[PDB]
Design an enzyme around this catalytic site. Structure first.
Site, PDB file in Angstrom:
ATOM      1  N   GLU A  25      34.387  87.334  99.865  1.00  0.00           N
ATOM      2  CA  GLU A  25      33.539  85.883 100.181  1.00  0.00           C
ATOM      3  C   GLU A  25      34.420  84.979 100.906  1.00  0.00           C
ATOM      4  OE1 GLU A  25      32.733  82.285  96.387  1.00  0.00           O
ATOM      5  OE2 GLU A  25      32.141  84.685  96.034  1.00  0.00           O
ATOM      6  N   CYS A  30      26.708 102.935 109.150  1.00  0.00           N
ATOM      7  CA  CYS A  30      26.259 102.914 110.460  1.00  0.00           C
ATOM      8  C   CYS A  30      24.733 102.463 110.952  1.00  0.00           C
ATOM      9  CB  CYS A  30      26.632 103.769 111.388  1.00  0.00           C
ATOM     10  SG  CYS A  30      25.655 105.436 111.043  1.00  0.00           S
TER      11      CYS A  30
END
EC number: 2.3.3.20
Lengths: 344, 339
Positions: A103, A129
């Site tokens: 965060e 990916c």
């Protein structure tokens, strides 16, 4: 006969695109010199990097470059390619595997660096990916609906740490053959970044169009490739076998939804995991190899940035003409398989 | 301008983590250090207002907690896993960088080969982002049902942060910001979203708005082992952003404060909540809070509070529910459910 859209995106375009090559070359020759004592102790006599995986070099950043910095650099280049200022962006999505922090999002950091407006919605997507495609699709839903005019999709990948710590572990006098095999694919990764500016087509009428496409999954295989900031463990044998089975299923879906036949596509932009994975994929589908640009040889596997980097290198090479049908596809850890179409 | 009209909430659930760690217990373990450093305010209990939090068993991962919530939400929706066409994981906690925690939850549940999975991260706002993402897919007809899941784990954050703080070298500045990590809690929630034609009596999701102030992306920086925050400044700028978001919510949703039946807010601390409520002139009775006993469960706070409202019988047909938060970034999102 009135046919439906098959839920493909309408009036969504690619306004700009760019990539950043990381500056420092690390050759497989140099890697192999560090690994040689371990190779000898393990009886390994072939060049598993250069000859088997087909990787001769990859690029690295300096140690202090974070994923956000690389993404920012690419985003500034894509904005120039789109000839628009940051104030026009309504959505910024970060798709990288690499991340500065749990965060806040890496997207917020990119956003703050570029100086987005207070109307700009931002967040990160993570899906190995395939995530760049997923970000494209999320931005395309907003653009198609007319909620925003322009969106940035950004991806910076930093593999420095994984290389440093994997080469340490793999040169231990006590590393086991199993551990060595489990971590080897980490030495096929590379650094790089890419960014794309997407737009409502009415704003950019000669720009390429993004249609979207199809996804299939096999999430019973979610253990095959696991990675953290310093380690990636990968069963490359089952990744290949199960990945291709998954891809065959997603290609049947692509024929139905996108109308694909391999011979009618002009370029295949593949998330490339290695040279044998790529050769296997191409042979399995009857794809013409001259339609498959590779950068793995000299850059390795740049994760979810691979697809837009390759698309950007095609653009810059002058390989893409108006009307060319470009297949974006890849098999990502999960397993997931995505296939989508751009019409240049 | 055009809100979602065919997106519904088919089911919802939450999981409370089973081990309690009281702030009194934390304070006793830290006492030698509070004294050795001349601290005499009880920051956790008296200032933050967090009297307890919950912890998982050892070795519960984010994916395990999310899985448990998802199974309960599927029961609340009366549907089996095979209907789910999208599974989004929105938690701060994540098992790995790759694969998605979503794929691991999906694999645990046995989703079909048609199910699309990925993770969204955006601090304490991500559940709302995940719901919006899923709404957009539902509305377009890509899927019939979506799962939005979020499992949060703070066991490591505690083990490490308390180990650090009680070592004999620890300075007062190191100590001070390590305290914010001691407001975190464990818990998990999940929601099944669906196309309204399939669940016509169910609550409706309308969508919402977002505004940002990403000039402040420095203020709250959270890893597996640590959380460093600037609590005062976060609060003030957070409220200014919320006020701008509320102006947007007037325009796109028709919001007026007095016309909303509940405010379901991402829950950080007592001062954070009280400042929000006072700024907007909201009736505190319309603001359920759980931080006093559970601490800050990050993005799971929003659905956990909504789930509690539902299972307590507090939501009636036609209630207008605001879901909102101020998240690290800074970002602020505000969305509407009509029960």
């Amino acid at each position: 006969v009135p046919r439906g859209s098959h839920m493909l995106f309408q009036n969504v375009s690619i306004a700009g695109l760019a990539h950043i090559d990381a500056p420092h070359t690390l050759t497989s020759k140099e890697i192999n010199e560090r690994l040689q004592p371990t190779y000898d102790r393990l009886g390994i006599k072939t060049d598993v990097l250069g000859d088997v995986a087909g990787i001769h070099a990859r690029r690295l950043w300096d140690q202090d470059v974070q994923a956000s910095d690389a993404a920012t650099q690419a985003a500034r280049k894509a904005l120039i390619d789109a000839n628009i200022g940051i104030e026009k962006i309504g959505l910024l999505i970060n798709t990288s595997v690499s991340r500065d922090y749990l965060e806040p999002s890496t997207a917020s950091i990119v956003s703050g660096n570029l100086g987005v407006s207070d109307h700009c919605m931002t967040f990160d997507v993570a899906n190995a990916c395939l995530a760049f495609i997923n970000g494209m699709d999320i931005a395309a839903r907003m653009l198609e609906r007319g909620e925003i005019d322009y969106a940035l999709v950004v991806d910076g990948e930093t593999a420095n740490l994984v290389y440093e710590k994997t080469l340490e572990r793999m040169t231990s006098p006590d590393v086991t053959e199993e551990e060595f095999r489990n971590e080897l694919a980490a030495l096929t990764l590379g650094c790089g970044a890419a960014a794309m500016v997407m737009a409502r087509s009415e704003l950019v009428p000669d720009a390429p169009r993004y249609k979207g496409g199809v996804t299939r999954s096999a999430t019973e295989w979610n253990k095959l490739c696991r990675g953290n900031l310093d380690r990636m463990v990968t069963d490359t044998r089952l990744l290949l076998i199960e990945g291709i089975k998954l891809a065959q299923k997603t290609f049947v879906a692509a024929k139905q939804v996108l109308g694909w036949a391999v011979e009618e596509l002009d370029q295949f932009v593949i998330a490339q995991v290695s040279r044998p994975h790529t050769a296997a994929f191409v042979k399995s589908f009857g794809i013409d190899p001259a339609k498959v640009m590779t950068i793995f040889g000299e850059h390795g596997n740049i994760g979810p940035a691979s697809v837009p980097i390759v698309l950007s290198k095609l653009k810059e090479l002058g390989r893409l003409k108006k009307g060319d049908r470009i297949a974006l596809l890849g098999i990502g850890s999960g397993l997931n398989c995505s296939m989508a179409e751009v019409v240049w």
